[PDB]
Amino acid sequence: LDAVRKRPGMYIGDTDDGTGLHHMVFEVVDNAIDEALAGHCKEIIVTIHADNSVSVQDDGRGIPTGIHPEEGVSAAEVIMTVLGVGVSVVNALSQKLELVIQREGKIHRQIYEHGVPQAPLAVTGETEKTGTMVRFWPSLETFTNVTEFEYEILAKRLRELSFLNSGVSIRLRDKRDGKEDHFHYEGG
Amino acid sequence: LDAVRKRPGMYIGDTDDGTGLHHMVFEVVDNAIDEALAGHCKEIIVTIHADNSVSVQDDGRGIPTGIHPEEGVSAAEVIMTVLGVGVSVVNALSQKLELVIQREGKIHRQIYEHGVPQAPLAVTGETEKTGTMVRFWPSLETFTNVTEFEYEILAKRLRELSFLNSGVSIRLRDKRDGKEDHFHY
Ligand SMILES: O=c1ccc2cc(O)c(O)cc2o1
Ligand SMILES: O=c1ccc2cc(O)c(O)cc2o1
Ligand SMILES: Nc1nc2ccccc2[nH]1
Structure with missing residues (x-):
């Protein structure tokens, strides 16, 4: 990951104007x-x-x-x-990143800071569900000026994506103001 | 360097009791x-x-x-x-590190943060002298509890080194309380 840390702009985009910051979300999406x-x-x-x-x-x-x-x-x-x-680029440029994987009846958890795992991936419990979750805190050492996520930028992109990915339910939720959207195109 | 960042204790020593913190200095020394x-x-x-x-x-x-x-x-x-x-271990576990090299009539400088160079090594001026200098700020994310450098721990080790390295002069200076020593065999 040191190559990404040396020159973040080459991998994520502009780290000042907010385009790189939102690309972090869209890469994970x-x-x-x-x-x-x-x-x-x-x-x-x-x-x-x-x-x-x-x-x-x-x-x-x-x-x-x-x-x-x-x-x-x-x-x-x-x-x-x-x-x-x-996602390794997003992990490298995130001051914290939480990974949660539900698979084979087991919950797996791991925490990262600036791309460095704090411990090995650990089975912490049990579950009937399956899936992957990543929650990340963008690094304020890399991302300057624009550091807060604009809802409209995410909402617009997720709407465009829904039409290219048939049968995929995409939910957007904002816990700051309670706003939310649901994009679910079932074409073909 | 991420292997060092994953398990700092395995490379530098215990990061809570002050062993690792002082070993940072000894590795550079x-x-x-x-x-x-x-x-x-x-x-x-x-x-x-x-x-x-x-x-x-x-x-x-x-x-x-x-x-x-x-x-x-x-x-x-x-x-x-x-x-x-x-010293790459020391660099990896330092929130900042300043490198100054005087060589071939030129002063060269470079700054690191957590082992990541902020720019390439750059010629910043002219000089008659020669040598290398590293100043480092230990990462407070890694080093807990014992964060400040005890003078006597450094002095003890540098004294041992002065006997072993008989030709080398070793000066120790504390700018917090003005204390100083000069170890030479
Ligand atoms: O690299 C990967 C692969 C799958 C994946 C799935 C997620 O839901 C996510 O948030 C991040 C992910 O990163
Ligand atoms: O080769 C090296 C690497 C690190 C280093 C650090 C110092 O402080 C010094 O005086 C000399 C050095 O030489
Ligand atoms: N604060 C901070 N910045 C970092 C960059 C690389 C590795 C660890 C780090 N901790």
Whole structure:
């Protein structure tokens, strides 16, 4: 990840005007849509939290959790820490990132700070559901001037995406003011 | 450097009781002694600053500044960023690190934050002297409980090193309370 840290603008875009900041969300959304498309029920939920973090959840299969034979860490960690631009770029430029994977009747949790895992991926409990959730706090050392998520920028893009991804429910929620939207195009 | 950032304790030592914190200084000192031995005057200066940073100067040749043909960046940056344990560990666990190299008539400067270079090594002026200086601010995210440098812990180790490295002068300076020592065999 040090290559991304050396020159963040090359990977995420402009870190001052807000375009790079919102690209962080849209990169994570693209990965969530890919997981949602693998299934039948397909739903993703994008939540803007009151602390200016954004979470993106899908109800897909859940990212692989088993140890990678070469790397010697969970396959999830490899996805989050090895260099669309990839979620690893978002992780590198996030001062905090929470990963939650529900898979094979188990809840898996891991926390990152500036791309560095704080502990190995851990099974913390049980669940009937499946899916992947990433909640990230953009790094205020990288992202300057525009540091708060504009609802309209996310709402507009998610609406455009709904028409290209048939059968995928996309929910947008703003916990700051309680505003929300539901984009669900079932064409074809 | 992310392997170091993942498990700092395994590389530097315990990050809560103050062992790791002081080992940061000792790792830098080892490299400063190597440079001091191969120069003329052979003196190192370890300064504890008021803002809880430590700087280690030597008056050696100055570490290489030219571009490394494999990595495509200054040889100094390769030393600071690629994995004695190495100063790259110290750089990785420092919230800020300032590198100053005097060599071939030129002063070179570079700043790091958590091991990430903020710009390439740059020529900032002219100079008659030679040597290398690293000033580092330990990351308070890594180093907890014992965050401030105890003078006697550094003094004890530098005394041991002065006997072992008989040709090298070792000066220790504390700017918080004005305390000083000069270890030389
Ligand atoms: O790299 C990946 C792969 C899948 C994925 C699914 C999510 O729902 C998400 O928020 C982030 C993700 O990142
Ligand atoms: O090769 C190296 C690497 C780090 C380093 C740090 C110092 O403080 C110094 O005086 C000399 C050094 O030489
Ligand atoms: N605050 C902060 N910034 C960082 C950049 C890289 C790795 C760790 C870091 N902690």
